[PDB]
């Protein structure tokens, strides 16, 4: 009864579309048409970090908003003190092909991974005084695209295996596996409460996941190409996705629909990274055109441009205190902006 | 004040610079091909290292990763060359090899990367031409070019088959590459031992043309 199940799936999809259409009584542009624009956002490179040699592939901020981990293709993590531009740590990696890096919320550990299909958790607070590999997680059958700490003992991972995983670092086992996507999962973002998390893949779809239940809740299907970047709105009721089709989008979980599209005709290059500001009024998106854009999250107008990089803006992050924005590019330089 | 932190950062910088110095002279290659192709046997994630005239070659075979391969090929946009191996003996799967070669050649991040092509398993191709091993494409219209330089003692059917396969791949090459990258066809076998020399020569040509472009020669 393959045809019967196919028809049932099509009918369910039509029902979902009808419910979404019914819920859409207005648009976020119309509702926000009376709110004052944010004006021209001028941001200047306050610090430039020049230790790296190869291309930067990921960075993450510490919860203290001061320390910063960056991963490069030359097989090197660097933990910097941004305030003083001096390197706290330089960790040499077994595999030079790193596509992700995460900083523990407590600051004790730092994770990395890539084409090795392994997520390596490194301990920083060693009594020996050197960063050791606390563990290697080796259950994925595809490249490691992203990873994010929940606490010191749980880490969520996304792979090109078309699956995500919730691990247990002490036992080195996949506590849970999320297996809904039909394509390489390229990014994930962890909710502020850590109960849920969103994942964007190359099937032009994003999915919301319950960490403890282990099941997909909602699937958002607006984009026309791969979703490279995903970030959560600060309040956990929305998220912004950046795709190869030179377009970002906003989705709200409760409405279960797309709200606004951040696109311009002069932009024909895909979005590499997406990040929000502390208030959520600024949506910073890195692009393949060697430069980053700053969008009015509510009015869709382009409020500013960060144009200091001479190669692809590989990664983009915003501090927990909203003080600065760190952009890392394929030119081997990280730049802090404010 | 804590100058010790700055001193530690300076030491970290020294070590990083030394590591970069060590790694700068290694020529990187990305080996990609089908399962039938004899990728492993060429050199005599998976990493391999070899040397020719004291230039280091680091060859990478991704192995267990994506098939669109597009999400990961961007990691290899600064390699010297892409070594593509095609099993010439298998006619039915040769269209698959041609399509994969077209995919790799027109990829956005590989517009500057040159491809070194190895039409492997040549003795099997010779054995299959035999009569029963007819050719799937519309091959009748093709005859060997006036500039053919066959290996001595090669049956003309064999040489025209070889040149047909090579012509197919180089046609896919020239039709879309805007002169920024060049494909280097070679015929190889299981017992062939000159492959490293061929990669060396091709890479020397690659860097020579990169220099010609850097100087606007």
């Amino acid at each position, epitope marked *: 009864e393959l045809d019967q199940l196919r028809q049932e799936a099509e009918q369910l999809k039509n029902q979902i579309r009808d419910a979404r259409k019914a819920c859409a009584d207005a648009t976020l542009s119309q509702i926000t048409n009376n709110i004052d624009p944010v004006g021209r956002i001028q941001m200047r490179t306050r610090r430039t970090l020049r230790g790296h040699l190869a291309k930067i592939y990921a960075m993450h901020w510490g919860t203290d908003s001061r320390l910063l981990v960056s991963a490069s293709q030359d097989g090197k993590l660097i933990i910097w*003190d941004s305030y003083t531009t001096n390197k706290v*740590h330089a960790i040499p990696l077994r595999s030079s092909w790193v596509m992700t890096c995460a900083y523990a919320p407590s600051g004790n550990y730092v994770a990395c991974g890539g084409l090795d299909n392994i997520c390596s958790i490194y301990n920083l607070k060693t*009594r*020996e*005084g*050197n960063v050791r590999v606390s563990r290697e997680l080796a259950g994925h059958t595809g490249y490691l695209s992203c990873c994010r700490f929940l606490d010191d003992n749980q880490i969520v991972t996304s792979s090109g295996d078309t699956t995500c995983a919730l691990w247990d670092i002490e036992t080195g086992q996949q506590t849970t596996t999320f297996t809904g996507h039909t394509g390489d999962v390229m990014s994930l973002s962890l909710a502020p409460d850590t109960r849920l998390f969103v994942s964007g893949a190359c099937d032009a779809s994003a999915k919301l996941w319950d960490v403890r239940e282990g099941m997909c809740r909602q699937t958002f299907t607006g984009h026309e190409s791969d979703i490279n970047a995903i970030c959560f709105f600060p309040n956990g009721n929305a998220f912004a996705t950046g795709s190869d089709d030179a377009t970002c989008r906003l989705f709200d979980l409760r409405a279960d629909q797309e709200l606004m599209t951040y696109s311009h005709d002069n932009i024909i290059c895909g979005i590499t990274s997406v990040s929000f500001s502390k208030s959520g009024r600024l949506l910073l998106a890195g692009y393949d055109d060697f430069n980053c854009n700053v969008w009015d999250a509510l009015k869709a107008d382009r409020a500013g441009v960060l144009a200091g990089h001479d190669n692809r803006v590989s990664c983009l992050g915003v501090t927990d205190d909203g003080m600065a924005v760190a952009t890392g590019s394929w030119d081997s330089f990280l730049k802090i902006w404010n | 004040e804590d100058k*010790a*932190a700055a*001193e530690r950062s300076k030491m970290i910088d020294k070590n990083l610079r030394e590591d970069g110095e060590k790694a700068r002279r290694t020529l990187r290659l990305l080996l990609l091909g089908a399962d039938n192709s004899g990728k492993s046997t060429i050199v005599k994630i998976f990493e391999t290292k070899f040397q020719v005239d004291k230039v280091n070659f680091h060859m990478f075979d991704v192995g267990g990763q994506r098939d669109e391969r597009r999400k990961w090929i961007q990691c290899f946009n600064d390699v010297t060359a892409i070594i593509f191996v095609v099993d010439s003996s298998d006619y039915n799967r040769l269209q698959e090899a041609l399509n994969d070669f077209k995919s790799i050649w027109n990829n956005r991040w590989l517009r500057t990367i040159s491809v070194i092509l190895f039409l492997n398993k040549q003795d099997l191709l010779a054995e299959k031409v035999s009569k029963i091993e007819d050719y799937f494409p519309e091959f009748a219209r093709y005859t060997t070019p006036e500039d053919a330089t066959p290996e001595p003692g090669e049956d003309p059917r064999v040489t025209r088959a070889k040149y047909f396969i090579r012509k197919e791949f180089v046609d896919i090459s020239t039709a879309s590459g805007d002169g920024r990258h060049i494909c280097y066809p070679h015929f190889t076998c299981a017992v062939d031992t000159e492959n490293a020399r061929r990669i060396f020569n091709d890479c020397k040509d690659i860097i020579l043309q990169m220099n010609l472009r850097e100087y606007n020669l």
Partner: single-chain antibody, 232 residues
Framework: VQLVESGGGLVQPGGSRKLSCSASGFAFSSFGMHWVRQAPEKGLEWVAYISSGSGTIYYADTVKGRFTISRDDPKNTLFLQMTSLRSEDTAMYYC??????????????WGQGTTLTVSSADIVMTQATSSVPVTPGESVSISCRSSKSLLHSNGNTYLYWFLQRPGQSPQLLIYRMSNLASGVPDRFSGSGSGTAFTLTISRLEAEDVGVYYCMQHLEYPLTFGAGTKLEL
């Protein structure tokens, strides 16, 4: 992590000797190393410092020129060559590791020490009372004063606290007036105001009996105060 110091013994005035420290259990090359001294029945007195990379060396004005500090990272040893000696050098010499980066814990580990017997701009740390009578189960506060404010422009109050139990080497308790060192019970707390600082022990115990020392890491002529002795 263990530092074992060798050398020591009797010497006539004017002699010379090389104290050594063998380090085993940590990345010696990535640490700085301090030579500290304790005269018999007296307090601590910083002697020398050699940094990671052997690129920065500092000496006390009481030993400059006479003493030299060197390190052999390949075989993890730290040497103090004493060239001229006098009665005031008679003391127990300790070796202290100190790693410097953002959020680090300098002065975390101390050696057992070696006895050696010989037959104005510096910041002054004052600890109010020589001793305090204490009883188990109660809370005790130790006071320290600095001649110069230890609050730098970067917000770090560079005061450190150490506890020396009877017959053992000093152990770090707090390293920037507020941060508790690893392995120290939570009962210890530290507060300050830039020139006056207080260390509070919530509940006394048999382990807390000993001499408490304060130190400053603002200007590298590190200065200790005559510690307060908690005995009962």
């Amino acid at each position: 992590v263990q530092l074992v110091e060798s050398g020591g013994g009797l010497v006539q005035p004017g002699g010379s000797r090389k104290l050594s420290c063998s380090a085993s259990g940590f990345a010696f090359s990535s640490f700085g190393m301090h030579w500290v001294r304790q005269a018999p029945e007296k307090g601590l007195e910083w002697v020398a410092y050699i940094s990671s990379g052997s690129g920065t060396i500092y000496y006390a004005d009481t030993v400059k020129g006479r003493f030299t500090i060197s390190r052999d990272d390949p075989k993890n040893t730290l040497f103090l060559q004493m060239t001229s000696l006098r009665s005031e050098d008679t003391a127990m010499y300790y070796c202290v590791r100190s790693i410097y980066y953002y959020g680090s814990s300098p002065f975390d580990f101390w050696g057992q020490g070696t006895t050696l017997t010989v037959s104005s701009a510096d910041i002054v740390m004052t600890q109010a009372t020589s001793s305090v009578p204490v009883t188990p189960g109660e809370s005790v506060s130790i006071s320290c004063r600095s001649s110069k404010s230890l609050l730098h422009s970067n917000g770090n109050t560079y005061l450190y606290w150490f506890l020396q139990r009877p017959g053992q080497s000093p152990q770090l308790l707090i390293y920037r007036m507020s941060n508790l060192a690893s392995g120290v019970p939570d009962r210890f707390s530290g507060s300050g105001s830039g020139t006056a600082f207080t260390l509070t022990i919530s509940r006394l115990e048999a382990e807390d009996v000993g001499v408490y020392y304060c130190m400053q890491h603002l200007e590298y002529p590190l200065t200790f105060g005559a510690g307060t002795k908690l005995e009962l």
